[PDB]
Amino acid sequence: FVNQHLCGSHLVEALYLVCGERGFFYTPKT
Amino acid sequence: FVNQHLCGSHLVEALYLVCGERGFFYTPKT
Amino acid sequence: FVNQHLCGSHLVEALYLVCGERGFFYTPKT
Amino acid sequence: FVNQHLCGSHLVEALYLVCGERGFFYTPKT
Amino acid sequence: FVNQHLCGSHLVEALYLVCGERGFFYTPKT
Amino acid sequence: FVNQHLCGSHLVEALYLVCGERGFFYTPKT
Amino acid sequence: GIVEQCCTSICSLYQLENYCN
Amino acid sequence: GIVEQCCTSICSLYQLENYCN
Amino acid sequence: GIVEQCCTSICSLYQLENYCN
Amino acid sequence: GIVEQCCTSICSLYQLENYCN
Amino acid sequence: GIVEQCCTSICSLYQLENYCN
Amino acid sequence: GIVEQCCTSICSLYQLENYCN
Ligand SMILES: [Cl-]
Ligand SMILES: [Cl-]
Ligand code: NA
Ligand SMILES: [Zn+2]
Ligand SMILES: [Zn+2]
């Protein structure tokens, strides 16, 4: 697979695609 | 603000907008 | 709720989410 | 250009692309 | 990675994420 | 119609809208 | 209107242009 | 849960806020 | 306007409500 | 093909990779 | 190419039609 | 974190898997 910059909502749409059923967390504060 | 019909990626995009840099969990059933 | 930068199509998707049934106008010329 | 099936946010994203910085109104029924 | 239900623009967005700067073809039937 | 900058996934969503049934290719390497 | 026609039926980009400012 | 309620039914932005960190 | 307010600078969802019909 | 399989059925990201250049 | 044309510079929807099959 | 890793710098889909539940 390939890399690149994912920012704002593009990052959570990528998480959605990757994780889907499993769910994910999005924590920009960490 | 109005009521929403939100499926798939659109739900996560809405969470991103509502929660922002506070972050969020996405936890579907199964 | 939280703030941040919304540009291009992200701004009108945010308007859609916020306004929904009511509709909105998007006028970058003002 | 081809015919489109456009629901929800996708309709507003298409308006954004078609109208651009001329801007647009989004006026659903009810 | 999980299985996906991907329609419309969402299929092309997933191709973009999976293929990246390698690029891709989008070839629907008819 | 109008112009403007289309980058990342926004470019392939624009291709999808424009081309639809016909399909398209996205080749950033050219 | 257009919102319903695009979603329930189909519409063209040329039709969408009518909602430009 | 929310994922199902927003999609199968409807939900408010105020409901979505409950999933903020 | 909305671009200058929500894009170049930041804006709240409540300000975006200013642009609802 | 893939466009139909992803939408009517389901598909994997590994399947989508086959349409990469 | 398309990136240099529609992203780094701007492009019209008619130019994007150049990349339809 | 994820922002610093996948946004400011670049990241792979495998790294994004780190943030699945
Ligand atoms: Cl962007
Ligand atoms: Cl959809
Ligand atoms: Na999108
Ligand atoms: Zn974007
Ligand atoms: Zn959608």
Protein described:
- The complex is a heterododecamer, with six copies of chain A (30 residues) and six copies of chain G (21 residues).
- With 30 residues, chain A is of the alpha+beta class.
- Chain A has one helix and one strand; from the N terminus they run αβ.
- Chain A has one helix at residues 9-19; one strand at 24-26.
- Chain A is globular.
- Chain G has 21 residues and is an all-alpha fold.
- Chain G has two helices and no strands.
- Chain G starts with a helix and ends in a 5-residue tail after the last helix.
- Strand 1 of chain E pairs antiparallel with strand 1 (24-26) of chain F, so a sheet runs across the interface.
- The PDB classes it as hormone.
- Keywords: Insulin-like fold, Insulin-like superfamily, diabetes, hormone.
Keywords, please?
heterododecamer; A: 30 residues; alpha+beta; G: 21 residues; mainly alpha; 2 helices; flat; binds chloride ion; binds sodium ion; binds zinc ion; hormone; Insulin-like fold
First CA to last CA of chain A: what distance?
A: 26 Å
Look at the helices and sheets of chain A and give the structural class: alpha+beta
Share of helix of chain A, binned:
25-40%
Largest interface, C-beta closer than 8 angstroms, per-chain residues = A-L, 22 and 17 residues
Strand residues, percent of chain A: 5-15%
Q: Structural class of the secondary structure composition of chain G?
A: mainly alpha
Shape, per Cα inertia axes of chain A: globular
Tell me roughly what share of residues is in helical segments of chain G: 40-55%
Separate helix tally of chain G: 2
Helix count from the secondary structure assignment of chain A:
1
Give the topology:
The complex is a heterododecamer, with 6 copies of chain A (30 residues) and 6 copies of chain G (21 residues).
Chain A: H1 9-19, E1 24-26
Chain G: H1 2-8, H2 13-16
The complex binds chloride ion (2 copies), sodium ion (NA) and zinc ion (2 copies).
PDB class: hormone
Keywords: Insulin-like fold, Insulin-like superfamily, diabetes, hormone
Assembly: dodecameric
